[PDB]
């Protein structure tokens, strides 16, 4: 599965 | 028969806390994510919270962010909504919903009424 | 920056005249990902051509496979025409049975 | 007997031609099993392997939601990185992301990865400890500071150790007939007068193979391994010889290294 | 945040007429994540269309859904006396968002 968590972004 | 049963609703003083429960039957509750949806009398439906099937992902509406907590325990097939610092704007009929999917499975509860007033 | 593709034209199975087969054009080692690839029969484009999904290797270079159903024949000539931003003119790589 | 699961993401800006083009592809070892294309009509994650089609529709809903979230993240990061490098709005730029996990024969976690690229060069990567980041330039140090202040490596490590490994085990069990196969190469030698000798290796899985030419026991054209199109791979090596040569093939499916001589 | 704008707010129609309902999304959605609901004045909402075009189980053929991207439509070719209710469009791509709701009433 792909990552379900959100990141802040570059 | 796929069924969802609500309990724990009632009249609450403004600022107090209250917990709602959904008992799931007839379907594999642990496999799917679950929602909470509320509807104030004479108003439209408003999504409140969602929890993923394993409980890792939890999201809330901006109106209830930081005040409402959503949880599940897959052993008893129960969904929980913990509401703290309840305001009068939280007065609505709350639904636990197995829906919002592409394959057309849509299960609602009977609805539990929460009234917040002095 | 700008990596020129490496083209490889081959058949899925060892070619036998009159037997159904697939013609493959493997393009790899290029950047950016924009590219046009044509499979040609006797110098004329083949209309029913499928390709894989765009992916990249460890050094971030892209690769793609273009395939189509074809029956080998001695008379027919097959090739692959590839155009990239790094290429001044389209490059044609003929299909060789022994390569 | 180790196995890997990888996800490859490419996002290319198309100034004046709409939103960026996003491609997402998932791999287990050398086999692709999922794909998402922003230019496709369905706008959903789609199966590419038969053993993944047994998953329920809720699995595909979750995959579509998460992959579209990743697409939006890359869409925003394209503008952020265009601002970082003082790039104009006219040009087109690419962001590439790859992450995955390695598993052993026992089914235990081995290694976790996440590498990002901008315009084909390294931008930022997770270290082997799964706790620190490596930046390639000054624009990437801003991202490194942001990701350290956000404790992003912790969530990434949680995914890589726990979720990736368990889902890789589940996929390996679902596709045990295909994913855990190992096809020995169909090997033969050809001669063409210029002269040359070509050592063919066809129809082998996985793609890792070694072809070596020895002149009386001493090592000496080699094309890269290419897909056959049916889940197998092909490769050949050539040597130009005057009018005593042996080719050696090493593959997982082969019990012992082959030793091929002409005729 | 995806905002679902539902138009019009009220449909004053006579039974046996055609009802057209519009839903506006703030961003492009995958069609599989859009649904329509019907709510009677005393009970829970009932799903009519899922995937923006697929009727649910035991739904009459008069209800039909269409649209793509940001524009979606719900059509009731022949209004039965039981069809006069409140209809909601819904997206499920990111959390859940219901439209304001269109009320179909008797002219
Ligand atoms: C940074 C990464 C990114 O761009 N994301 C992260 C995921 N995501 C998202 N956001 C929200 O927000 C909740 C509310 C809505 C208004 C803004 N905010 C206060 N909710 C999400 C979800 F609810 C889901 C989700 N949706 C459904 N229908 C079911 C389930 C089980 C989930 C989830 F898995 F998350 F629990 C999703 Cl998939 C994503 C959500 C975007 C901002 C994109």
Structure explained in plain terms:
The complex is a heteropentamer of chains A (10), B (118), C (99), D (263) and E (107). Chain B has strands spanning 3-7, 11-12, 18-25, 34-39, 45-51, 58-60, 68-73, 78-83, 92-98, 107-108, 112-116. By secondary structure, chain B is mainly β. In chain B, the strands form two sheets. In chain B, strands 2, 4, 5, 6, 9, 10 and 11 form a seven-stranded mixed beta sheet that branches. Chain C has one domain: Immunoglobulin-like. In chain C, the strands form two sheets. In chain C, strands 1, 2, 5, 6 and 7 form a five-stranded antiparallel beta sheet that branches. Chain C has a four-stranded antiparallel beta sheet with strand order 4-3-8-9, with no helix packed on it. Chain C starts with 5 loop residues before the first strand and ends in a 5-residue tail after the last strand. Chain D has two domains: 3-179, MHC class I-like antigen recognition-like (Murine Class I Major Histocompatibility Complex, H2-DB, Chain A, domain 1); 186-261, Immunoglobulins (Immunoglobulin-like), CATH 2.60.40.10. Chain D contains four helices and 16 strands. Chain D has helices at 57-84, 138-149, 152-174, 176-179; strands at 3-12, 21-28, 31-37, 46-47, 94-103, 109-118, 121-126, 133-135, 186-192, 196-204, 210-215, 218-219, 226-227, 233-240, 245-250, 258-261. The longest helix of chain D is centred in the first third of the chain and has 28 residues, at 57-84. Chains C and D meet through β1, β2, β6 and β7 of C and β1, β2, β3, β5 and β13 of D. The complex binds the ligand *CCC(=O)N1CCN(c2nc(OC[C@@H]3CCCN3C)nc3c(F)c(-c4nc(N)cc(C)c4C(F)(F)F)c(Cl)cc23)[C@@H](C)C1. The ligand *CCC(=O)N1CCN(c2nc(OC[C@@H]3CCCN3C)nc3c(F)c(-c4nc(N)cc(C)c4C(F)(F)F)c(Cl)cc23)[C@@H](C)C1 sits between chains B (33, 50, 52, 57, 59, 62, 100) and E (1, 92, 94-96).
Helix and strand topology:
The complex is a heteropentamer of chains A (10), B (118), C (99), D (263) and E (107).
Chain A: no helix or strand
Chain B: E1 3-7, E2 11-12, E3 18-25, E4 34-39, E5 45-51, E6 58-60, E7 68-73, E8 78-83, E9 92-98, E10 107-108, E11 112-116
Chain C: E1 6-11, E2 21-30, E3 36-41, E4 44-45, E5 50-51, E6 55-56, E7 62-70, E8 78-83, E9 91-94
Protein name (chain A): GTPase KRas
Binding site for GTP (chain A): 4-10
Family (chain A): Belongs to the small GTPase superfamily. Ras family.
Helix and strand sequence of chain E: EEEEEEEEEE
Percent in helix of chain A? under 10%
Largest sheet of chain A: none
Q: Structural class per helix/strand content of chain E?
A: mainly beta
CATH architecture of chain E: Sandwich
Largest interface: chains, residues each: C-D, 27 and 31 residues
CATH class of chain E: Mainly Beta
- Oligomerization state of this entry? heteropentamer
**What is the CA–CA distance across the termini of chain A?**
22 Å
Distance between the termini of chain E: 36 Å
Q: What percentage of the residues of chain E does DSSP assign to strands (E)?
A: over 45%
The CATH homologous superfamily name of chain E equals Immunoglobulins
Main sheet summary of chain E: 7 strands, mixed
Strand coverage percent of chain A: under 5%
Report the radius of gyration of chain E as a whole number of Å. Answer: 13 Å
Helix content of chain E: under 10%
PDB class: protein binding
Keywords: Antibody, Cancer-neoantigen, complex, protein binding
Assembly: pentameric
Entry title: Structure of the cross-HLA supertype antibody R302 bound to a class I MHC presenting a divarasib-modified KRAS-G12C peptide on HLA-A*03
